[PDB]
Write a protein that binds this DNA or RNA. Structure first.
Lengths: 87, 221, 129
RNA sequence: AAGCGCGCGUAGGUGGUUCAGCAAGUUGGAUGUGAAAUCCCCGGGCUCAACCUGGGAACUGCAUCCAAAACUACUGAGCUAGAGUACGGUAGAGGGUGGUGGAAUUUCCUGGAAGGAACACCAGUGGCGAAGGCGACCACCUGGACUGAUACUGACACUGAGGUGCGAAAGCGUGGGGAGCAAACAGGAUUAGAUACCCUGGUAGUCCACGCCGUAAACGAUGUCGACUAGCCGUUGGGAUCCUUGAGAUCUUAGUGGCGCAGCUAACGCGAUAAGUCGACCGCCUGGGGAGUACGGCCGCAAGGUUAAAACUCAAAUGAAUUGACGGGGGCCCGCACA
């Protein structure tokens, strides 16, 4: 998984009436942080496709959570596409 | 008749295990008690009261009933509590075919009618094995001396072993009555009687409810 | 996934009609509640029982006949896929007219007898027979 | 005859839940038509029938128009059940890298030295992964579900042609290794003959790194997903109930099995892990041969694979089941059949 220090760290800018861990600030961008740091083990273990099928499972679900923000909230979408180093 | 102190006395509230039961007797389980299932004791009261009403309102209307209590532990009173009644009965090896193979077995009653010379006399080797087989008939034809043709009502004891005898009864349309335990299904019997048939002293709580009532149907005529 | 609200209730009672159960409870909608009200007026069921709480539910009290109960089959016609929008001249007299043939119209989700004498057709919902 | 081996998911098909709105589909009426002919009935006529016409009926159609708002789309605010995440806790042959092992067996040599490979027991109608698949010991970087709840999201949904990855082993690449066996064979014994099973021998191969093939008796010969309809007996992971010492019951779930009604089925049999009742969608089938073959396209170094025909030809091939017969099928029994 992610680091025990980190998975409780990254929520500190996702707060937005802080008790939310459910809006797509969290399941995009905890999950975007899952994308950006678990690249490491692939370089050593390139013969195990079980771990990047989870990557494509949630980067679609991130894009699915981008897809609902296409219509529900375009303005807070700019906080996602403008930030995080996307695209 | 309907009172509790002989209803509670012997065997009735006992029943078959939580390993051994059909849920169609799920309307008749009065609590689970050491993993054996209890006859429902309060709506028992209309059913085995109606078991004495219907048995006398046709005994005054001239029927004649058969008694299938075909069990090894229950055939003892079935020779005794159906001798006090005027009914035909069979308690050991219901032969598959009674009231269907009937016009074959109608003339399979007579090994004593055709030997009314020698059973009163003693033809020694050639008449012993005919008279050793003289109990091969009334082992299954024990109450079937009088038959009147086809039976009119039918009262069963063990639905679980002799399921044949009820599928004999539904195959014609003769009205079905009998005691049922939680092991078998209360389905095929026309109107139910919930009650145990595994204890030996639980048997004659209904069999001496018959000999009480079988004279109380013949008294109307 | 579940894809049709009222075909999920019309299946779930028929296997309970051949089972020995009486009160059927499921999470229900107003769509499933408007269907249930018309066939209790046709003598099939009674007391739909909106639970009137959060996650509202329907407790349809279906009646038994002696032995085989009152509703043999409920045949879905307009399922969600091919959805059978039908006129007033072409209403189905299901079993000689002994099926009441409830059809969703603007002025009421209503049987075929009142659908023709006040002429609106539409979603021919299900066989009630 | 027919479920791709399974996934991620594009268009699309369909879409939990509530009020309100729209009036595209849906619903009614209005009007113009839908030519005439033909047809359908009532007729008129040929002396009768065709035929001929008169009258209508019919023309399920098309747009326009107003009226309707239960449902669908669309529009907006929502609702928490579907679906997801923040919190541990185990269970787990997940999978991969590097090592550390042991006995045989094998190969040497005077019990040691030497290296390959699969790891007896633990082993399980057990786990794990979408699937293919996967067990000595050990760390190291890493998955998805379960469950205990507590938090929050507000259908974000499932399915999905194309499209895209990923799929047992013999392979043949591009480099290495090296025990046993063994594809390739030589004889040995054997038969009309071995080209066979048996017998003496051994390179390719399995192994490794990257890469290609993408094949299957990929089989549970059962697509994925959700809902609901009697049960009962083991067994796997949690959790709570439990007089409690567990020797453990019960309950609760998510898996893995046995047997059985309702149920279906041609039958065998399935039977809440359906092969029922259903719903959305997808793949697939149309008599047996020809044939999964030619030809054309695509991929491969090759072997080939994938998509996929007709010409001809036959009135049958096939499925489960039953009687008889047969069997170098088993099991009992009889008789000088065996001494």
């Amino acid at each position: 998984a992610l680091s025990v220090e980190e998975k409780a760290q990254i929520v500190n800018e996702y707060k937005q009436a802080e008790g939310d861990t459910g809006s797509p600030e969290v399941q995009v961008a905890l999950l975007s942080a899952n994308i950006n740091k678990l690249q490491d083990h692939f370089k050593a273990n390139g013969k195990d496709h079980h771990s990047r099928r989870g990557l494509i499972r949630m980067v679609n679900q991130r894009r699915k959570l981008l897809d609902y923000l296409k219509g529900k909230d375009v303005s807070r979408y700019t906080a996602l596409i403008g930030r995080l180093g996307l695209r | 008749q309907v009172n509790m102190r002989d209803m509670l006395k012997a065997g009735v509230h006992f029943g078959h295990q939580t390993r051994y039961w059909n849920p169609k007797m799920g309307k008749f389980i009065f609590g689970a008690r050491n993993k054996i299932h209890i006859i429902n004791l309060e709506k028992t009261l209309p059913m085995f009261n109606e078991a004495l009403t219907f048995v006398e309102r046709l005994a005054a209307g001239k029927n004649k009933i058969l008694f299938v209590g075909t069990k090894r532990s229950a055939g003892k009173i079935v020779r005794e509590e159906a001798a006090r009644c005027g009914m035909p009965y069979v308690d050991h090896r219901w032969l598959g075919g009674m009231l269907t193979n009937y016009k074959t077995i109608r003339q399979s009653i007579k090994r004593l009618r055709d030997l009314e010379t020698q059973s009163q006399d003693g033809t020694k080797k050639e008449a012993l094995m005919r008279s050793r087989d003289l109990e091969k008939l009334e082992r299954s034809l024990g109450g079937i001396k009088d038959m009147g043709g086809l039976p009119d009502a039918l009262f069963v004891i063990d639905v679980d072993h002799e399921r044949i005898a009820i599928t004999e009864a539904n195959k014609l349309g003769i009205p079905v009555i009998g005691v049922v335990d939680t092991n078998s299904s209360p389905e095929g019997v026309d109107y139910v009687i919930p009650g145990n048939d595994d204890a030996i002293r639980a048997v004659q709580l209904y069999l001496n409810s018959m000999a009480e009532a079988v004279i109380r149907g013949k008294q109307g005529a | 996934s579940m894809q049709d609200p009222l075909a999920d209730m019309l299946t779930r009672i028929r296997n309970a009609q051949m089972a020995e159960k009486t009160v059927v409870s499921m999470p229900s909608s107003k769509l499933k509640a408007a269907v249930a009200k018309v066939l209790k007026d046709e003598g099939y069921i009674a007391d739909f029982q909106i639970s009137s709480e959060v996650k509202p539910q329907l407790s349809i009290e279906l009646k038994y006949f002696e032995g085989k109960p009152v509703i043999e089959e409920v045949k879905r016609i307009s399922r969600p896929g091919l959805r059978q929008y039908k006129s007033v001249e072409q209403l189905p007299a299901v079993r000689g007219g002994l099926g009441v043939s409830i059809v969703s119209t603007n002025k009421g989700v209503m049987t075929d007898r009142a659908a023709r004498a006040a002429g609106v057709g539409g979603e021919v919902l299900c066989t009630v027979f």
